[PDB]
């Protein structure tokens, strides 16, 4: 699991953010380094071993101007040192960086059954 | 509830994180409510534009040289020029937390002791602040007393809507400083 | 809930009943929040000493010659001398209700339209009113908007602690007055 | 008939019960009550407790002058000059209250619907 990309939340019931498992703390305890630079221990049930966020997933996208909105993943584009998601909203599609794509409590819970590490 | 992290830990975060600062302004008040209830200290909060209670403050921009610089700037916008009569410094820093909001934001909480005169001036001129009528709908004082019925006062004030973990930051500051 | 009754019926109640009067002071507000959310009207409410939000007003004493004399008196002690520039009268009377609290209290609700300048005037002077820092912890404006998330603004403002039927009275007044 | 009998009733669906008398049976299971405080309105039989005096050991809400109120237990009745006085025990101490200063909360009154409700 060390070095595997995941999407996990650091608060009791916050959003899931992208990161990697840095170490296996043992007994359902994992230490994660998020792509944003934040490190903390997270429980297996709050981790989604899921990368990339699969197509047709309802996600939360972030814009540079403080706005955020829901959308559907319709494309993946890998570039050197970064992944880009194609998010569709109201018929149109826009590219977002990896860190700009997160999951609300509801959006990530739909993936626990298949991708959860609880 | 919101995850606490050290100040240094917060400053070392990537550029994807934004930083907000808010300050609890308090002053000693020898007044007596009804002549039998000591007010003790006067603590200021503000009714936010979203209908929630919180402390004054705001975002820290690139123009800000430090967290404290951005704080005092925001305070001047939200409270008026009476805020220029003092300054919140690193010595007033209390804690840092990760906000529950979707965007990546870290919140820094401060607490500064003022004189009852400095606090009144803030209240007096709060209506002229840039954010009055827009971002700030009005200032309120935190009641530190509990009325005879055991629910009125602080217990009922803590039942209002608060932004983020302001309620928890409030209670932490009442104990650590012995204000209550 | 709170049972309403005609004014006359309330005036017929015995001396065991206490009377309270509260006024809804509103003014046309052409401003906007963030340049896209209309403020519509500026509406003032008080954070009362018990940590609850309510309209400005208070109890009617036997000394007061009438319901209105008492209201205007309370409005001066709560809002300051700027409240003398106007006077709430029987024409501003809206409804009467028996409060659901344990005591026997009938609440008389008034709505008075002011001009933006008048409403801003009482905001600036409330800090030196007799009740400031005692019976009144501060004044706040009512957000009549609803933010993008659907909860911010009025919906969350309605989640705070209110006095009696202030929430229902506020909403009933907004619909009746047609300010929404 | 119930006319003239003393009762304890709430004029609000989920309010407190206040002392009064039934003044008339106006049909449809409704009874016009004259509360001791001078208020008069039609109240359903379900909101009327045919219970006078409030029996001993009943948990009641005692009203003080000013705006204070507290829960207590009835430990005594005293009828002097037609008026009824209740002796309320609270924290091992007893105090006298007039009839109108003794009310029942929704809970306190619901406990008596079976034995006294209409």
UniProtKB/Swiss-Prot annotation, chains B, C:
User: What pH dependence does Swiss-Prot or TrEMBL list here?
Assistant: Gradually increased from pH 6.5 to 8.5 in its IDP hydrolyzing activity.
Q: Which GO terms describe its biological process?
A: dITP catabolic process; mRNA catabolic process; NAD-cap decapping; negative regulation of rRNA processing; positive regulation of cell cycle process; sno(s)RNA catabolic process
Span(s) of short sequence motif Nudix box: 59-80
Q: How is its activity regulated?
A: The phosphatase activity is inhibited by the product IMP.
Is 4Fe-4S a UniProt keyword of this protein? no
State any single GO MF term: 5'-(N(7)-methylguanosine 5'-triphospho)-[mRNA] hydrolase activity
Q: Where in the cell is it found?
A: Nucleus; Nucleus, Nucleoplasm; Nucleus, Nucleolus; Cytoplasm
Q: Which InterPro entries match?
A: NUDIX_hydrolase-like_dom_sf, NUDIX_hydrolase_dom, NudT16
Tree of life domain: Eukaryota
Give tissue specificity per the record.
Expressed strongly in lung, kidney, adrenal gland, testis, heart and brain.
| Ranges of residues in domain Nudix hydrolase | 16-172
Q: Where does substrate bind?
A: 22, 48, 55, 169
The record's EC number reads: 3.6.1.62, 3.6.1.64
Q: Which PROSITE patterns match?
A: NUDIX
Q: Which Gene3D superfamilies match?
A: Nucleoside Triphosphate Pyrophosphohydrolase
Catalytic activity reported: a 5'-end (N(7)-methyl 5'-triphosphoguanosine)-ribonucleoside in mRNA + H2O = N(7)-methyl-GDP + a 5'-end phospho-ribonucleoside in mRNA + 2 H(+); IDP + H2O = IMP + phosphate + H(+); dIDP + H2O = dIMP + phosphate + H(+); a 5'-end NAD(+)-phospho-ribonucleoside in mRNA + H2O = a 5'-end phospho-adenosine-phospho-ribonucleoside in mRNA + beta-nicotinamide D-ribonucleotide + 2 H(+)
Q: Indicate what this protein is called per its UniProt record.
A: U8 snoRNA-decapping enzyme
Query: What is the phylogenetic placement of the source species in the record?
Result: Eukaryota, Metazoa, Chordata, Craniata, Vertebrata
The gene from which this protein is expressed is: NUDT16
Curated annotation (Swiss-Prot), chain D:
State what changing residue 79 to R does: Does not affect monoubiquitination by MSL2
Phenotypic consequence of residue 39 to S: Decreases affinity for histone H4 that has been dimethylated at 'Lys-20'
What positions does the cross-link Glycyl lysine isopeptide (Lys-Gly) (interchain with G-Cter in SUMO1) connect? 79
User: What does the record say about PTM?
Assistant: Asymmetrically dimethylated on Arg residues by PRMT1. Methylation is required for DNA binding.
Q: Where is this cross-link: Glycyl lysine isopeptide (Lys-Gly) (interchain with G-Cter in SUMO2)?
A: 79
Question: What effect on the protein does mutating residue 11 to F have, as reported in its record?
Answer: No effect on recruitment to double strand breaks
Q: What is the effect of changing residue 37 to R?
A: Abolishes recruitment to double strand breaks and induces defects in class-switch recombination (CSR)
Q: Report the superkingdom from the record.
A: Eukaryota
Domain remarks: The Tudor-like region mediates binding to histone H4 dimethylated at 'Lys-20' (H4K20me2). Interaction with NUDT16L1/TIRR masks the Tudor-like domain and prevents recruitment to chromatin. The UDR (ubiquitin-dependent recruitment) motif specifically recognizes and binds histone H2A monoubiquitinated at 'Lys-15' (H2AK15ub). Phosphorylation of the UDR blocks interaction with H2AK15ub.
**Quaternary structure, from the entry:** Homoligomer. Interacts with p53/TP53 (via the central domain). Interacts with DCLRE1C. Interacts with histone H2AX and this requires phosphorylation of H2AX on 'Ser-139'. Interacts with histone H4 that has been dimethylated at 'Lys-20' (H4K20me2). Has low affinity for histone H4 containing monomethylated 'Lys-20' (H4K20me1). Does not bind histone H4 containing unmethylated or trimethylated 'Lys-20' (H4K20me3). Has low affinity for histone H3 that has been dimethylated on 'Lys-79'. Has very low affinity for histone H3 that has been monomethylated on 'Lys-79' (in vitro). (Microbial infection) Interacts (via C-terminus) with Epstein-Barr virus lytic switch protein BZLF1 (via C-terminus); this interaction is involved in the activation of the viral lytic cycle.
Q: What does this protein do?
A: Double-strand break (DSB) repair protein involved in response to DNA damage, telomere dynamics and class-switch recombination (CSR) during antibody genesis. Plays a key role in the repair of double-strand DNA breaks (DSBs) in response to DNA damage by promoting non-homologous end joining (NHEJ)-mediated repair of DSBs and specifically counteracting the function of the homologous recombination (HR) repair protein BRCA1. In response to DSBs, phosphorylation by ATM promotes interaction with RIF1 and dissociation from NUDT16L1/TIRR, leading to recruitment to DSBs sites.
Q: What is this protein called?
A: TP53-binding protein 1
Query: What is the scientific name of the source organism?
Result: Homo sapiens (Human)
Q: State start and end of the fragment within the whole protein.
A: 1485 to 1602 of 1972
């Amino acid at each position: 699991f060390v070095g595997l990309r995941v999407v996990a939340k650091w608060s009791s019931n916050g959003y899931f953010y992208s990161g990697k498992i840095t170490r296996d703390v043992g007994a359902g305890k994992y230490k994660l380094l998020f792509d944003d630079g934040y490190e903390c221990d997270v429980l297996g049930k709050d981790i989604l071993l899921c990368d990339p966020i699969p197509l047709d997933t309802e996600v939360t996208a972030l814009s540079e101007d403080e706005y955020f909105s829901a959308g559907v993943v319709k494309g993946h584009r890998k570039e050197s040192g970064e992944l880009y998601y194609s998010i569709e909203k109201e018929g149109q599609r826009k590219w977002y960086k990896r860190m700009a794509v997160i999951l609300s409590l509801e959006q990530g819970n739909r993936l626990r059954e298949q991708y959860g590490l609880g | 509830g919101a995850k606490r992290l050290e100040l240094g830990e917060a400053l070392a975060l990537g550029s994807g994180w934004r930083h907000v600062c808010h300050a609890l302004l308090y002053a000693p008040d020898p007044g007596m409510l009804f002549g039998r209830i000591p007010l003790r200290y006067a603590i200021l909060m503000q009714m936010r534009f979203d209908g929630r209670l919180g402390f004054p403050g705001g975002f820290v921009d690139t123009q800000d040289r430090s967290l404290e610089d951005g704080l005092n700037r925001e305070l001047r916008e939200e409270l008026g020029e009476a805020a220029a009569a003092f300054r919140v410094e690193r010595t007033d820093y209390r804690s840092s937390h990760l906000t529950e909001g979707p965007h990546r934001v870290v919140a820094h909480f401060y607490a500064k002791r003022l004189t009852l005169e400095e606090l009144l001036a803030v209240e007096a001129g709060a209506t002229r602040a840039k954010d009055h009528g827009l971002e700030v709908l009005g200032l309120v004082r935190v009641p530190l007393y509990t009325l005879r019925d055991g629910v009125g006062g602080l217990p009922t004030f803590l039942e209002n809507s608060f932004i983020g973990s302001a309620r928890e930051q409030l209670l932490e500051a009442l104990q650590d400083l012995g204000l209550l």
